[PDB]
Each structure stands twice: as C-alpha cells, then as structure tokens.
Amino acid sequence: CAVTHEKCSDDYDCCGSLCCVGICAKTIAPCK
Incomplete structure (x- = not known):
C-alpha cells in the first residue's frame, strides 16, 4: 500500500x- 502523502490509485491502495x-x-x- 501507499503511505501518507504518497499518491493513491484508490482508497484501499x-x-x-x-x-x-x-x-x-x-x-x-x-x-x-
């Protein structure tokens, strides 16, 4: 998963x- 402030593909990402x-x-x- 992506951490805080990283770009997200979606919410569950x-x-x-x-x-x-x-x-x-x-x-x-x-x-x-």
Whole structure:
C-alpha cells in the first residue's frame, strides 16, 4: 500500500485508515 502523502490509485491502495484524495491522506469520512 501507499503511505501518507504518497499518491493513491484508490482508497484501499492506501495504508492504515488513510483514504485516497489525490494522495493517501485521512479524510473526514472513513472510506474503509
């Protein structure tokens, strides 16, 4: 998975509970 601040292909491509918003970042809403 991609870590914080890395570009994301999709939400589940991001590590932790991060979501995809251009980059892997935690949004307000939990995508997972």
